[PDB]
Amino acid sequence: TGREILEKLERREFTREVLKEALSINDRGFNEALFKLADEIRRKYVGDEVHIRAIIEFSNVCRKNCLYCGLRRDNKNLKRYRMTPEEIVERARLAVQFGAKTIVLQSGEDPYXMPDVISDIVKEIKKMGVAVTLSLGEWPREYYEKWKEAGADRYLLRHETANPVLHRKLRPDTSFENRLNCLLTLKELGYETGAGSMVGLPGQTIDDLVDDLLFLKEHDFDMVGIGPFIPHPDTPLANEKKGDFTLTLKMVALTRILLPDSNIPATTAMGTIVPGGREITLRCGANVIMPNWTPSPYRQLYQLYPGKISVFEKDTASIPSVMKMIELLGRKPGRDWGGRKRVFET
Ligand SMILES: C[C@H](CCC(=O)NCCC[N+](C)(C)CCCS(=O)(=O)[O-])[C@H]1CC[C@H]2[C@@H]3[C@H](O)C[C@@H]4C[C@H](O)CC[C@]4(C)[C@H]3C[C@H](O)[C@]12C
Ligand SMILES: C[C@H](CCC(=O)NCCC[N+](C)(C)CCCS(=O)(=O)[O-])[C@H]1CC[C@H]2[C@@H]3[C@H](O)C[C@@H]4C[C@H](O)CC[C@]4(C)[C@H]3C[C@H](O)[C@]12C
Ligand SMILES: C[S@@+](CC[C@H](N)C(=O)[O-])C[C@H]1O[C@@H](n2cnc3c(N)ncnc32)[C@H](O)[C@@H]1O
Ligand SMILES: C[C@@]1(C(=O)O)N[C@H](C(=O)O)C[Se]1
Ligand code: SF4
Ligand SMILES: [Cl-]
Incomplete structure (x- = not known):
């Protein structure tokens, strides 16, 4: 019964069978209760602040060929771009001027920058007194070490799927x-x-x-x-089904239940597959939002998946827009860098 699964989640009995049963039950009552539980856990552990991470997608060049991704190397039907180091630093400075307290640098796996141009950019951004997060893919240990010495604070490297x-x-x-x-x-x-x-x-x-x-x-x-998988027409997976929003939202909710003190974004992909999907996700366990800060004319070329939101507006719209979002959700913007604040428990 759904009630017994909720009770087991509440008591932290995180077995494989409890998780499977949570993800397999399709009852609306159960799902709503699960989302309420995650929302409440989020409020109790990480509060009402929603942390803003301004993302600059500085290059869409990639050496890898992942089957799902529109930036894969085999996709010839994409204009490739690279921002200059000066452009990236000055665009970061504009985000800091707009109130961002974390800058996220994301790219394809583009050899050009690696490792020293990234290090130089990171050092300049760190002078602005904000957190720096990198999301550059898989590189040697030595590159990661250089970037940590340069001052990077965080690294995002989705594991994608834990099925080898x-x-x-x-x-x-x-x-x-x-x-x-x-x-x-x-x-x-x-x-x-x-x-x-x-x-x-x-x-x-x-x-x-x-x-x-x-x-x-x-x-x-x-x-x-x-986030959901979103098929891209210039990839081998073009004709595959998109991921289900509700199932993906349950994964976000369970993640918060499992990792109550973690930082969990409401991802752009969630807002792409369903209008208002990020707002829903912020009410089902998420506590971070990542407004797109890539400048025109490059923003529209970072086509990982189709239909990506935030492309038709002026390139400075996203930070104000998420600040409005946070207010209408009855939440508060982050006051500090929004680093993880561990709550040690049993
Ligand atoms: C906004 C809609 C519809 C609400 C509604 O329209 N319900 C009828 C009117 C109720 N009012 C009290 C306003 C008047 C009653 C008198 S009346 O005479 O109208 O009947 C309600 C219906 C189901 C609700 C979600 C679920 O919980 C799951 C989840 C829990 C989290 O924690 C917060 C996020 C989330 C996604 C919820 C958000 C929101 O909350 C929803 C969509
Ligand atoms: C960038 C320009 C020119 C001046 C400038 O270069 N300003 C640097 C500010 C740096 N900080 C953000 C770190 C100040 C924090 C002050 S605070 O008291 O908020 O801690 C300034 C002038 C007016 C400022 C906007 C308005 O205000 C309204 C609004 C307030 C939100 O809040 C943040 C978003 C928004 C849209 C603001 C963004 C930005 O800022 C603007 C455009
Ligand atoms: C575009 S990559 C850029 C950073 C780095 N190249 C990496 O792969 O970690 C960022 C993330 O985009 C997501 N992504 C790629 N293609 C997607 C698609 N078709 N649908 C949804 N998400 C996708 C993946 O989960 C990936 O971790
Ligand atoms: C920034 C990012 C994230 O979750 O950290 N969200 C992106 C998206 O959903 O488009 C793909 Se990677
Ligand atoms: S950008 Fe990241 S997800 Fe896309 S092909 Fe390159 S390595 Fe794979
Ligand atoms: Cl971050």
């Missing part, structure tokens, strides 16, 4: 073992480390989603980014 077989099929340049090794290296180097997965990948099962949740709980990640 599926991982290798979808990401044929690499492996789950490599992805995990990168995540473990990032943790050892002292980064606040983010992981997370897509929901609704072709071939992915409910038991695979359970394994994503257990993986996340095992490693105690500081941040967890979850």
